[PDB]
């Protein structure tokens, strides 16, 4: 129904913090429907330009509306999201709902990837399960899990821009490896899938190194360079990490990092960004600053 998406957009213009309390049936519907569409589409998305790409939102619902305000609400534009929708922020429930709605309404112009914070392992503890349990019930959180497990892992835009939440993997040799993993699936402790959602680029590291997070790896400019060449690609688009200005380059503009949730947590005191990728595969960046 358009009723749920209407009610979600209704709090636009309101002072930041006002909730939107859907019925659990609506939300359940949103999960089950979008779940079916996720398994309808490939786990490795073959996408086309033009599209706008966003990074971590982490429940900051009113900042998401600002991004849509500028970028045009679907289907004014096409959208890829690089995961990490829930936790840390005040309104995870609204955020994931609005997105799934759009995914259901425009399944061919709106796309969602799995971020590391789309696991029962990490929704618990970091704030999402708490929100479900406070505003709804445990059973509803289990539903969300079962929906998150069907999320796409990576995407490729016009056979040139590789998009995923975390980054590269030492176990990644061919793309057909990404197409092999059957959904639904939980993110494992270690391996290809986990690396894709957890790994980081590192300036000081040479090759494959340890990660301060405690899971997966750090990688260096050499791996980025040789990966693009080996796969007929020009750029790696990823999120996962907090960077001021919203975006930050790695290697010689061979990997960009996108973070779309301003003043994350906070404090951190950062900014958010999104990539405008046009039909000529030209990328431009638009910055969001922390609101008054």
């Amino acid at each position: 129904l358009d009723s749920i998406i209407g009610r979600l957009l209704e709090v636009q213009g309101s002072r930041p913090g006002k909730n939107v309390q859907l019925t659990e049936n609506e939300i359940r519907g949103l999960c089950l429907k979008s779940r079916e569409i996720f398994l309808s589409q490939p786990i490795l998305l073959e996408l086309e330009a033009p599209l706008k790409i966003c990074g971590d939102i982490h429940g900051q619902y009113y900042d998401l509306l600002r991004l849509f305000e500028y970028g045009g609400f679907p289907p004014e534009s096409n959208y890829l999201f690089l995961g990490d929708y829930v936790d840390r922020g005040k309104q995870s429930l609204e955020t994931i709902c609005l997105l799934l709605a759009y995914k259901i309404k425009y399944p061919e112009n709106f796309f969602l990837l799995r971020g590391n914070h789309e696991c029962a392992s990490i929704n618990r503890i970091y704030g999402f399960y708490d929100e479900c349990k406070r505003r709804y019930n445990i059973k509803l959180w289990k539903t969300f899990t079962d929906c998150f497990n069907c999320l796409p892992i990576a995407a490729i835009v016009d056979e040139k821009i590789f998009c995923c939440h975390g980054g590269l993997s030492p176990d990644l040799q061919s793309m057909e490896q990404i197409r092999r993993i059957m959904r639904p699936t939980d993110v494992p402790d270690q391996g290809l899938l986990c690396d894709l959602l957890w790994s980081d680029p590192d300036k000081d590291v040479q090759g494959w190194g340890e990660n301060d997070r405690g899971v997966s790896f750090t990688f260096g400019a050499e791996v980025v360079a040789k990966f693009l060449h080996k796969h007929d690609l020009d750029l790696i688009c990823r999120a996962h990490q907090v960077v001021e200005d919203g975006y930050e380059f790695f290697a010689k503009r061979q990997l960009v990092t996108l973070f779309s949730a301003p003043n994350y947590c906070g404090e951190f005191d950062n900014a958010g960004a999104m990539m405008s990728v046009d039909e000529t595969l030209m990328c431009s960046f638009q910055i969001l600053k922390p609101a008054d």
Partner: peptide, 13 residues
């Protein structure tokens, strides 16, 4: 046919 390019200037929203 098409290759990746970056607009040098960014803009504030």
């Amino acid at each position: 046919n098409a290759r990746v390019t970056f607009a040098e200037a960014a803009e504030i929203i």
